[PDB]
Design a protein around this ligand. Structure first.
Ligand SMILES: Nc1nc2c([nH]c(=O)n2[C@H]2C[C@H](O)[C@@H](COP(=O)(O)O)O2)c(=O)[nH]1
Ligand SMILES: [Mg+2]
Length: 129
């Protein structure tokens, strides 16, 4: 009955663009282009879980918050929770420590192909823009 939670937030840049985390560059499933905010589970609260890990996945001081969308799905004995928060701004550059360096990209062209298919229902909403 293991349940793993995940909280993410698309950081908004100075040009209506957000920085997402990609699987570096191939050699590790390049089609898993996801976003920061992993390990929020631990033992935090639905609200403090992201807010705390946020510093861990951004480290900087960004005007980040809001909830764009949230998806809750369960895998064969593995409950995977994915929370999508709506970020509005970020000072300097996002660093934190997620494990996959990112760059300021435009979400206007987000793709369900580049990202992990495990979170399509969520992207299906924003993808349509
Ligand atoms: N299918 C799959 N899921 C993974 C891998 N690594 C990994 O972290 N995950 C999962 C578990 C987490 O709940 C979520 C976010 O990353 P973390 O495990 O690093 O926090 O995605 C992996 O190699 N394969
Ligand atoms: Mg983390």
């Amino acid at each position: 009955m293991k349940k793993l939670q995940i909280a993410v937030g698309i950081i908004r840049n100075e040009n209506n663009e957000i920085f997402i985390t990609r699987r570096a560059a191939d050699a590790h499933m390049a089609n898993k282009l996801e976003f920061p905010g992993g390990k929020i589970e631990m033992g935090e609260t639905p609200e403090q879980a992201v807010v705390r890990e946020l510093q861990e996945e951004v480290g900087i001081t960004p005007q980040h918050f809001s909830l764009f969308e949230k998806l809750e799905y369960e895998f064969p004995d593995r409950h995977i929770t994915l929370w999508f928060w709506l970020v509005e701004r970020w000072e300097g550059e996002p660093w934190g420590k997620e494990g996959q360096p990112g760059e300021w990209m435009s979400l206007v062209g987000l793709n369900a192909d580049d990202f992990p298919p495990a979170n399509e229902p969520v992207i299906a909403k924003l993808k349509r823009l």
